[PDB]
């Protein structure tokens, strides 16, 4: 009784951009994970720390589900100790974290003729992100000996750039929806728990 909302996160309609990943809290639930890894739609179901089949027996304090959309060739960056745009200037996972990473293709929903310019990603940043950070600032990236004063120009660029998702992009340049479940335990009781 009182199951967990794994339908408003996975089977939703519109996901967010990886520079504005959507976080959701889950507590006081009976979360049933077996329904997840008992499927073929999930092309990627990695799990760090915990084991997949041993998930309906633990009891964590709370769970954090981070949903977003990325390319197909950028999924290898969703993991501890990686490097690139996604991991550095966008969603960054800590080192030796406990949780699971799920990812599956969405070339049906997130593909448009002429390009879906609604999905964006941060390309420039003067430094790297700390783990679990969110920088939505659309400020101007300065790369020269000339201030930008909030005006795009020479060597002063815009950090957020669009994915050009089309339905003909073959495999690696196709949209992939990603959900990251972080199982955060604390010294407080274990509200979440598996079925019985």
């Amino acid at each position, epitope marked *: 009784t009182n199951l967990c909302p794994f339908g408003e996160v996975f089977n939703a309609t519109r996901f967010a951009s990886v520079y504005a990943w959507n976080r959701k809290r889950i507590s006081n639930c009976v979360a049933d994970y077996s329904v997840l890894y008992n499927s073929a739609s999930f092309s990627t179901f990695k799990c760090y720390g915990v084991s997949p089949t041993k998930l309906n027996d633990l009891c964590f304090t709370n769970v954090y589900a981070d949903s977003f959309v990325i390319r197909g060739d950028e999924v290898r960056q969703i993991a501890p100790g990686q*490097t690139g745009k996604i991991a550095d200037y966008n969603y960054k996972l800590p080192d030796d974290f406990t949780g699971c990473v799920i990812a599956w293709n969405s070339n049906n929903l997130d593909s448009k003729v002429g390009g879906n310019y609604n999905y964006r990603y941060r390309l420039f940043r003067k*430094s790297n992100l700390k783990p679990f950070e969110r920088d939505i600032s659309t400020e101007i990236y300065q*790369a020269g000996s000339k201030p930008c004063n909030g005006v795009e120009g*020479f060597n002063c*660029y815009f950090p957020l*750039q669009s994915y050009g998702f*089309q339905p003909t992009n073959g495999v690696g340049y196709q949209p992939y929806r990603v959900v990251v479940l972080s199982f955060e335990l604390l010294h407080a009781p274990a509200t979440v728990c598996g079925p019985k």
Partner: antibody
Amino acid sequence: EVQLQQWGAGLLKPSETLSLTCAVYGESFSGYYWSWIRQSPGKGLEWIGQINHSGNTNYNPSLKSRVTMSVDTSKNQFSLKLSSVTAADTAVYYCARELGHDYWGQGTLVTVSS
Amino acid sequence: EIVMTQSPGTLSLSPGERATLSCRASQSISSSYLAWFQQKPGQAPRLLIYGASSRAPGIPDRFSGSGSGTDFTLTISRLEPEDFAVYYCQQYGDSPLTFGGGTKVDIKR
């Protein structure tokens, strides 16, 4: 204006390591990303990586395994180390500022031969 | 990696003529983020055109750019002896960067 001075080893041998250093004179060394670029006849202009004033590195997936970088803010220098070199890594190496649109080095010709 | 391809691979012109080089990308590119670099013997590259349409400082008004998506075009109205060199196309809209192969511009006779 900015000036960039290159140095490093030229001739080398396979299985060895190629080290290069670029020094900056003319402006601030913090706030920008300093990049390394490569030019070989056949592969054209290639990009290797870029480093910050705090050790933050962006590499190229084709060389993420072999490429290593270093930065010294005291003398305002950055440096590249490329491991397990061959006769394919024979090329002209440039040091540039982020998105070299503004300023480049002069060129260090690195050759590899047993 | 966004592979770029320059067309043609070589040219042959004469002072006073007009030149046109093309860069075709494997996949559509960000807003207009494509640059054109000049490189001569020995020296290091130099930037002329950014955004595929803008003309950087210190660049004569004869260099022009245009295009979008997977087709960009650089044009030189009135050539000059200083303009016979190698030209590259660059994309700074997706990581990592990506240069072309080059398009030499040789004198004719």
